[PDB]
Design a protein around this ligand. Structure first.
Ligand SMILES: C[C@@H]1C(=O)N(C)c2ccc(-c3ccc[nH]3)cc2N1C1CC1
Length: 124
């Protein structure tokens, strides 16, 4: 019922280590991680544990902060924009699967606004 998690390594993918990417890990991610609403987004959605066989029938591009953290630690990304895309996929997935006002959407909304606050300004 659970698909394979997103990849966190890809040896033929060209990696790069930029100051903006070190800041996504050290500042942006690792503080979202400590938020009280972070825990549902710290690993892939477990459709078996949740008894939600419907999740991966709706969400075809899954993403979680657990995956993003490992991609940052492993220098998976070419630039910060690629990592910011993964965050936005994580948020959008939650808004697509759930409905306005759901508890999980409130958590996503709060994390997103803190996220956007923190990447308004990145190192140069
Ligand atoms: C599937 C949907 C969703 O979009 N996310 C991101 C998510 C992540 C984690 C958990 C979760 C609850 C208890 C253990 N894990 C639940 C969700 N939900 C929503 C329906 C409660």
């Amino acid at each position: 019922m659970n698909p394979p998690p997103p990849e966190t390594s890809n040896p033929n993918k060209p990696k790069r280590q930029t100051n903006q990417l070190q800041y996504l890990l050290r500042v942006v991610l690792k503080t979202l991680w400590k938020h009280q609403f972070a825990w549902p987004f710290q690993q892939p959605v477990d459709a078996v544990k949740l008894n939600l066989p419907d999740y991966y029938k709706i969400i075809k591009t899954p993403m979680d902060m657990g995956t993003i953290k490992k991609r940052l630690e492993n220098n998976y990304y070419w630039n910060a924009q690629e990592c910011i895309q993964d965050f936005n996929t994580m948020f959008t997935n939650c808004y697509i699967y759930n409905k306005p006002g759901d508890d999980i959407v409130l958590m996503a909304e709060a994390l997103e606004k803190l996220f956007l606050q923190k990447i308004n300004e990145l190192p140069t």
